[PDB]
Amino acid sequence: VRLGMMRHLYVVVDGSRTMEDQDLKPNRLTCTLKLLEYFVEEYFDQNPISQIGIIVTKSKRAEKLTELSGNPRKHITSLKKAVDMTCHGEPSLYNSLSIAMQTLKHMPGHTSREVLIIFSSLTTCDPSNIYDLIKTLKAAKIRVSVIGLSAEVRVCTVLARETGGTYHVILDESHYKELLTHHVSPPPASSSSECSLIRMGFPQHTIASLSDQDAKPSFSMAEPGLTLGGYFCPQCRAKYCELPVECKICGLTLVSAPHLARSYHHLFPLDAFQEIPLEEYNGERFCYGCQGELKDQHVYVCAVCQNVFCVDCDVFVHDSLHCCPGCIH
Amino acid sequence: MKLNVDGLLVYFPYDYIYPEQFSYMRELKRTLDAKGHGVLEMPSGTGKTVSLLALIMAYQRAYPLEVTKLIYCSRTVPEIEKVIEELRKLLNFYEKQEGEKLPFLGLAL
Amino acid sequence: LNLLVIVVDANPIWWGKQALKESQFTLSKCIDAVMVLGNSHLFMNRSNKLAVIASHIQESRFLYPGSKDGKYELLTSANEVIVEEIKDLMTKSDIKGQHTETLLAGSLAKALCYIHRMNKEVKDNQEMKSRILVIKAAEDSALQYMNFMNVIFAAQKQNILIDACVLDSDSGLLQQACDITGGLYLKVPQMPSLLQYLLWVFLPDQDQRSQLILPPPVHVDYRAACFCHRNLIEIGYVCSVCLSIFCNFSPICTTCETAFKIS
Amino acid sequence: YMESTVASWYEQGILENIQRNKLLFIETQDGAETSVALEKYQEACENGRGAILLSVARGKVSEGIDFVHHYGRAVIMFGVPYVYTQSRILKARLEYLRDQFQIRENDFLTFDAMRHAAQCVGRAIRGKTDYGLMVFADKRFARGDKRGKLPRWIQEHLTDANLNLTVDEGVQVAKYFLRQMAQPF
Amino acid sequence: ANKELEEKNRMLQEDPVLFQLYKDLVVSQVISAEEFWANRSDIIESIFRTYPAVKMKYAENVPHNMTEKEFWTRFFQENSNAAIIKRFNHHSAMVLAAGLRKIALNLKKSDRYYHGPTPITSQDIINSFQSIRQEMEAYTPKLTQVLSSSAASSTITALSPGGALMQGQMVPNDIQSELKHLYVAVGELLRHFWSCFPVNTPFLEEKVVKMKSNLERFQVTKLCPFQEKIRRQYLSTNLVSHIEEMLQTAYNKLHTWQSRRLMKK
Ligand SMILES: [Zn+2]
Ligand SMILES: [Zn+2]
Ligand SMILES: [Zn+2]
Ligand SMILES: [Zn+2]
Ligand SMILES: [Zn+2]
């Protein structure tokens, strides 16, 4: 199944009044922002080439809280700042979606544009009928997958399925973590999705040549002090503090090899290991994965290496490591 | 989806039927077998009509002399229109199953 | 507490070459030095616990899950268990000419989950700061790049420090591994005096590593290369499916077979 | 009664707040206004504004209209539907049934409400298994006589636990129930 | 309409950086400013859109020998019973009316990833395998064999700042601000110059702006070294050479592509 590795996703957060209601244990807005901060960092940690941008809508107006960027820390700072937001007004999907459309209209065709609307107040007061905006989205192939809160809103139901996205409603706080983490993984590319080669640039960390001879002093490029050494660009030739960052001049993505390698495991998903509770002639008391005695009647095995893994080993392997330890041999 | 009803075998266009439909059809057949007027209630606004319509059609084929024709009345013309759609769908399903036209007529006044 | 894990790279093909060369340094001393480091580590505090892992071309087997000489009982078990286990692995080993490169990625893979297994069982009251003191001793294998990169990222998310201690060779991959997770990288050139390094560089833990002077990190060449040649390339043309660095613009990348539309 | 309740709410701030939360539509005797109001109501349901259609149980709109998925999601019944006890026409119809066929006046009178109430509340379950909750804002429905005369399918779902939920209590269960139906099969 | 003049006035003082850089291109008279931009309450408002009658009344009742406070007073001011229901339906209808304006993947070479971009007899294994097997018949030599003082002493010296494996200035502050301002100026003008440079753009109208932009590189770069000369002739310390590489590298791309364009022709 084709997957779009690079994606420009917008996490539209609604500053509606209904967010005031403390349906969750803490304030509803704070819980999303607190948990969304986990999503932002994790999203970057599972798709470095991708970038994110947050739009906050309240009082019938949508304001871009943070433009598209590749620095998780910069976005994280905005989330904490928004925790103190007044949280008064009424959201407007047309205003929010339109703002995302304008910035995403000029994005490259190869990258998979996406939008994740965290809808809280079921109402949607918009200057123009939103059904018309749907027609534009399908042509613009912008995936919109709402995650409703405490409501199965009708208008977003057609929005998700017509536009290709998925619609969900929060069963509880624990279920809320599950939903956002699911969206972290790149979505499969459908027929409408198209793939195209994208120019890429690989910089090399550089320092003073020899005892600060013919040095290359420079401060930064987006209160930066002088830097003896740092990253550079094949074309900009402008010092960059951290990678991966999009060129401020070339417009060509700058990214090192490891960041790309972070996204390979998506192409190679790990086949689920059959769970056989009985020992099944497994005389090895020690779990191969962790060299620990199997204290529970559960076992996992591959279709190639045919090894034995306990509950923690298999759960861990599929979740984070994304590769079978013994089966690598 | 041919249903082996207790009285006879009855065709059905949709794939599955809830347990209430089984209870509905058998009770309806019992009244038809007894040839006596009766009353029954079904919750669903839609779904009863196809079950009600399908059972009558099957009963007609088994005992055409028993029932001359079906007079199915509905409250409002906008509502009765939705019924003929259900009947029209059923006939095509039955026609496809049989593969040929049969001397069956259905019209709304 | 701190849970140390020592990944000793005991490659018989390379280590045995030292025996043939009759060099001063030998695998036996290497095990003894690591043994001492483990003993010294657990020496630091009761709460501290350690482990050991050996690497072979076939697989990796853990070397670790009275006072006859007047010794501490616990460390005595460590001394006996590793010595008995290491000899068994070295003495018994099948021969496969096709596969001779040392296996390290899988060896680490066992460690990462092992720490996770310990991290779950330990009481939530005490926080555990795990570490991996990888000790390479032979050149790495090209085919192992993909698997090794994944485990390194897993360590980053799981907050484990990969303290590489390569010797006799500078594996560009391993030094790349340690940098991602913030682990130190020391290339000891005096193998006989290896042990003085560990008790000074590696032994101090992440808690005190910052407030201490240690050798500066080595510059890392994050090179990129096309699949055509494997040569350094500064501009790569990746697609949206393969995510593979390629040499020059092509109608369709071979590893994708996609219907790229020109424009 | 609808106008009096509407006017009373209008004087207080309750009505204005409801306008803020969701659009509000009302029914009138004239058919022309009813068709336009309902026509606008359907559009509101399609959009995210929503709508609150106030109507009368005996209204020709209630019988003619059918509510489906994302239409009339939560049917609210304000008071047991009873005809005015002054219309002399019902008396000859009513008192006669007591003399012939031996039906108590209260029995038929209550039967005249549950059938009428059931007519105007059974629409949300039209078909295709579209979720929906039917709330009846009257303690009279809690009486055993009303519950028994209620249709079996509705009544069997009803339980004593939720039989007489408080206004606050009823809202909370409504929120929780919708969550369950929101997720797929 | 003089829309451009209004936009400049709005951003004349609201944003310092945007106007600071735009002026700088004209401070030294580099190029014309035309190319600069060419390339790059609630209650009344709700009533304004809510009630068309109020809009008609407002136009006809525009303040004339009256006060806005009085106009506010006029707002709130079975026959009456039905009016509210009708008004709500009309008011609700008006509010609604206002809001309604008129691929499975397959691959042939997967081993390539296994050895990614990272770059790079038989009896010898037998000899090593057996020789090592006989190495560790003796164990636990730690007492003296593991380390010796003479080797230990050398290691500590190596760890010294002058030793092996252990190799071992914010004086200007006001110059820092000047350098920052210059760098931003390069980015603004480089951005447009590089905006369409990578793309071939083999079109007459597309190529013209590049030629104009390419010529502008000479003009903007003409004044750059003059400011450098002023800064250079202060102390001749802490050389600022990074700026030069951008200009020459930009020049190299300009000339190299110019030759390629001639070669293509
Ligand atoms: Zn660049
Ligand atoms: Zn295990
Ligand atoms: Zn396996
Ligand atoms: Zn190539
Ligand atoms: Zn490809």
Swiss-Prot record, chain A:
Chain intervals annotated as zinc finger (C4-type): 233-250
GO molecular function: RNA polymerase II general transcription initiation factor activity; zinc ion binding
GO terms (BP aspect): G protein-coupled receptor internalization; nucleotide-excision repair; regulation of transcription by RNA polymerase II; response to UV; transcription by RNA polymerase II; transcription initiation at RNA polymerase II promoter
Extent of the signal sequence: none
Modified residues (Phosphotyrosine): Y43
Principal location class: nucleus
GO cellular component terms, A-Z: core TFIIH complex portion of holo TFIIH complex; nuclear speck; nucleoplasm; nucleus; transcription factor TFIID complex; transcription factor TFIIH core complex; transcription factor TFIIH holo complex
Intracellular or extracellular location(s): Nucleus
Domain of life of the native organism: Eukaryota
Keyword annotations of the record: DNA damage, DNA repair, Host-virus interaction, Metal-binding, Nucleus, Phosphoprotein, Transcription, Transcription regulation, Zinc, Zinc-finger
UniProt-reported outcome of changing C287A: No effect on the transcriptional activity of the reconstituted TFIIH complex
Family: Belongs to the GTF2H2 family.
Protein name, per record: General transcription factor IIH subunit 2
Lineage: Eukaryota, Metazoa, Chordata, Craniata, Vertebrata
Portion of the full-length sequence here: 53 to 387 of 395
UniProtKB/Swiss-Prot annotation, chain B:
PTM summary: ISGylated.
Subcellular location: Nucleus; Cytoplasm, Cytoskeleton, Spindle
Chain positions recorded as ATP binding sites: M42, P43, S44, G45, T46, G47, K48, T49
Disease: Xeroderma pigmentosum complementation group D: An autosomal recessive pigmentary skin disorder characterized by solar hypersensitivity of the skin, high predisposition for developing cancers on areas exposed to sunlight and, in some cases, neurological abnormalities. The skin develops marked freckling and other pigmentation abnormalities. Some XP-D patients present features of Cockayne syndrome, including cachectic dwarfism, pigmentary retinopathy, ataxia, decreased nerve conduction velocities.
Homology family: Belongs to the helicase family. RAD3/XPD subfamily.
Function comment: ATP-dependent 5'-3' DNA helicase. Component of the general transcription and DNA repair factor IIH (TFIIH) core complex, not absolutely essential for minimal transcription in vitro. Required for transcription-coupled nucleotide excision repair (NER) of damaged DNA; recognizes damaged bases. Sequestered in chromatin on UV-damaged DNA. When complexed to CDK-activating kinase (CAK), involved in transcription by RNA polymerase II. In NER, TFIIH acts by opening DNA around the lesion to allow the excision of the damaged oligonucleotide and its replacement by a new DNA fragment.
Record organism: Homo sapiens
Portion of the full-length sequence here: 1 to 109 of 760
Swiss-Prot record, chain C:
Origin superkingdom: Eukaryota
Keywords carried by this UniProt record: DNA damage, DNA repair, Metal-binding, Nucleus, Transcription, Transcription regulation, Zinc, Zinc-finger
GO BP field: DNA repair; nucleotide-excision repair; regulation of DNA-templated transcription; transcription by RNA polymerase II
Cellular component annotations (GO), alphabetically ordered: core TFIIH complex portion of holo TFIIH complex; nucleoplasm; nucleus; transcription factor TFIID complex; transcription factor TFIIH core complex; transcription factor TFIIH holo complex; transcription preinitiation complex
GO terms of molecular function: RNA polymerase II general transcription initiation factor activity; zinc ion binding
Protein family membership: Belongs to the TFB4 family.
Name of the protein: General transcription factor IIH subunit 3
Organism this protein belongs to: Homo sapiens (Human)
Lineage: Eukaryota, Metazoa, Chordata, Craniata, Vertebrata
Swiss-Prot record, chain E:
Entry keyword annotation includes Transcription regulation: yes
GO CC annotations, alphabetized: nucleoplasm; transcription factor TFIIH core complex; transcription factor TFIIH holo complex
Family to which this protein belongs: Belongs to the TFB1 family.
Subcellular location: Nucleus
A molecular function (GO) term: chromatin binding
Role summary: Component of the general transcription and DNA repair factor IIH (TFIIH) core complex, which is involved in general and transcription-coupled nucleotide excision repair (NER) of damaged DNA and, when complexed to CAK, in RNA transcription by RNA polymerase II. In NER, TFIIH acts by opening DNA around the lesion to allow the excision of the damaged oligonucleotide and its replacement by a new DNA fragment. In transcription, TFIIH has an essential role in transcription initiation.
Entry keyword set: Acetylation, DNA damage, DNA repair, Host-virus interaction, Nucleus, Phosphoprotein, Repeat, Transcription, Transcription regulation, Ubl conjugation
Gene name in the database record: GTF2H1
Domain BSD: 1-40, 41-77
Protein's GO biological process: DNA repair; hormone-mediated signaling pathway; nucleotide-excision repair; positive regulation of DNA-templated transcription; regulation of cyclin-dependent protein serine/threonine kinase activity; transcription by RNA polymerase I; transcription by RNA polymerase II; transcription initiation at RNA polymerase II promoter
Protein name: General transcription factor IIH subunit 1
Coiled coil location: none
UniProt organism field: Homo sapiens (Human)
Superkingdom per UniProt: Eukaryota
Main location: nucleus
